[PDB]
Amino acid sequence: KQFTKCELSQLLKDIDGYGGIALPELICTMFHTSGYDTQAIVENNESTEYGLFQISNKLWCKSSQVPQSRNICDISCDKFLDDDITDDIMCAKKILDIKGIDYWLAHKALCTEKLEQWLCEKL
């Protein structure tokens, strides 16, 4: 499941304003982060990041790769690879609450201006 800009927008609509974050800027961040793909898996040394919001097994979810993980979202990382983003949103709201929008590098780099394009058209 790879969403289009409008699909995701409607799904995340209730969340505009959460953490002081504007929906378009979150839309832009996700675009450069996973391309709105619920199956994105990105790996490196000490870790792997999962799904839509690219949540890290290093601190946020539990995976056999990093057994010492604090597992802040009390959930295994496979739950971020399925079609239901409900739980991904709950963990992401946790990240926003604790760390802030800066968890995602793409926000400060490409999502603080030219936001008009990240707005949904009409279906």
Rounded to a whole number of angstroms, the minimum distance from the CB of residue 2 to Ca ion is: 9
Contacts of 110 (CB under 8 A, 6+ apart): 28, 32
State the number of binding residues for Ca ion (CB under 5 A).
9
Residue facing Ca ion at closest CB distance: 38
Q: Of 83, 8, 6, nearest to 39 (Cα)? A: 83
Region from 29-37, 54-62, 73-81, 113-121 binding Ca ion, contact rule CB under 5 A: 73-81
What whole-number distance in Å separates Cα of residue 30 and Cα of residue 35? 6
Question: Which residue from 14, 46, 74, 84 is in contact with Ca ion, where contact means CB under 5 A?
Answer: 84
Q: Which amino acid is at 101?
A: I
17 token code pair: 């304003």
**Does 83 interact with Ca ion (rule: CB under 5 A)?**
yes
Residues in contact with Ca ion by the rule CB under 5 A: 1, 38-39, 79, 82-84, 87-88
Annotated binding residues for Zn(2+), written as ranges, equal 49, 116
